[PDB]
Every structure is written in structure tokens, then in C-alpha cells.
Design a binder for this molecule. Structure first.
Ligand SMILES: [Ca+2]
Length: 193
């Protein structure tokens, strides 16, 4: 469904000439996205609703650095996470806001908000599926760094106010990078860059 303009203020659009992936603002200088979204010349677009019209609340900021997870495997999408640094800090406001990293993993059954990009932001509320339901849908392919939820990519999966997933792959529920496994890496990496 249509989220409503700026109702997901941590949602970002990654643009290299066009919207190629979503991401999540985790502080004024850093965005989390999927490693499979990696490409050169990224501009981070904050405060977006319609990605084809300047509506008045946008901030466009060039990325200064991208860091793909050291263990990212593009064949399997294991460890599908990357960090993007903003060249200048975003000006935080009601429509441009960070989302908190988790301190613990979410449980099966927890409802989450998945969002991403006709040209306005779309939303889906869906529960995290059991481990078994997830792995049964994709035998051989699910690792401990993935979860499924259900009944673009790189965008957020937010549960109880925490960024628990990144839109990674699918076909059959969606498969999401399990952010709670990466919090130490995220925190150390951003602090060191
Ligand atoms: Ca816009």
C-alpha cells in the first residue's frame, strides 16, 4: 500500500542516475543497504516520496565511501549487507530521521514494516516466519544470516522500532538479511570510518 509521504523517514533512495536500491539511515552520516546493491557513483536521497518529482523535503548527498561486508557472497547472498557513508551529514528533521539498530534479534510472528519503491513509497506489514517455514520454502539456500517474512531491494524491514532486516532476495516469502547478526560489525565499521 501507499505509505504516505515521509511516513518512513529513515527510508532512503540510492540513485546513480535512477533509483537502483533502497537503504536505511542509521545516523546522520551512515546508511545501511544490501551488498548486492553495490555500484559506483551513489547519491543518497533522503526525505523522498515521489522519486520523480522534487516535492520540497529532499536532501541529496553524495556517498563518500561504500563498505561491502567482508564475507559477502554474491552467489548465495550470504552476508548481504553494506554500509554507505554520506559526504556531508544529513540535516535531521521529522521527515529525515534515523532508525535504531537492534540490540537483540526479533522472534517469529513479530510484525514488521517493509518499505520501498507507482513512484511513491510503498509499504507492507508482514510477520517474521518460522525458521522451518523459511527454510522449507527455499531448501538448501537459507543461512543463519537470513530470515523470511510474509504470508527494489536494500530497503528496511523494521520491527518494534529496530532495523531487523534488509530486503535481500526471494521469488514464496521474501528473504531478508538478519541485521541483528551484524550489529557489532556495523558499529565498529562506522566508528572506524
Ligand atoms: Ca522527490
Amino acid at each position: 500500500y501507499t505509505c504516505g509521504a515521509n511516513t518512513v523517514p529513515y527510508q532512503v533512495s540510492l540513485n546513480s542516475g535512477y533509483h537502483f536500491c533502497g537503504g536505511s539511515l542509521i545516523n546522520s552520516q551512515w546508511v545501511v543497504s544490501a551488498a548486492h546493491c553495490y555500484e559506483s557513483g551513489i547519491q543518497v536521497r533522503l526525505g523522498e516520496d515521489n522519486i520523480n518529482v522534487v516535492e520540497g523535503n529532499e536532501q541529496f548527498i553524495s556517498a563518500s565511501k561504500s563498505i561491502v561486508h567482508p564475507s559477502y557472497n554474491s552467489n548465495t547472498l550470504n552476508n548481504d549487507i553494506m554500509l554507505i557513508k554520506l559526504k556531508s551529514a544529513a540535516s535531521l528533521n521529522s521527515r529525515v530521521a534515523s532508525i535504531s539498530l537492534p540490540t537483540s534479534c526479533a522472534s517469529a510472528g513479530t510484525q514488521c514494516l517493509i518499505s520501498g519503491w507507482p513512484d511513491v513509497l510503498k509499504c507492507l506489514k508482514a510477520p517474521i516466519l518460522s525458521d522451518s517455514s523459511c527454510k522449507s520454502a527455499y531448501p538448501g539456500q537459507i543461512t543463519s544470516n537470513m530470515f523470511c517474512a510474509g504470508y527494489d531491494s536494500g530497503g528496511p524491514v523494521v520491527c518494534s522500532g529496530k532495523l531487523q532486516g534488509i530486503v535481500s532476495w526471494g521469488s514464496k516469502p521474501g528473504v531478508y538479511t538478519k541485521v541483528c547478526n551484524y550489529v557489532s560489525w556495523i558499529k565498529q565499521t562506522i566508528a572506524s570510518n
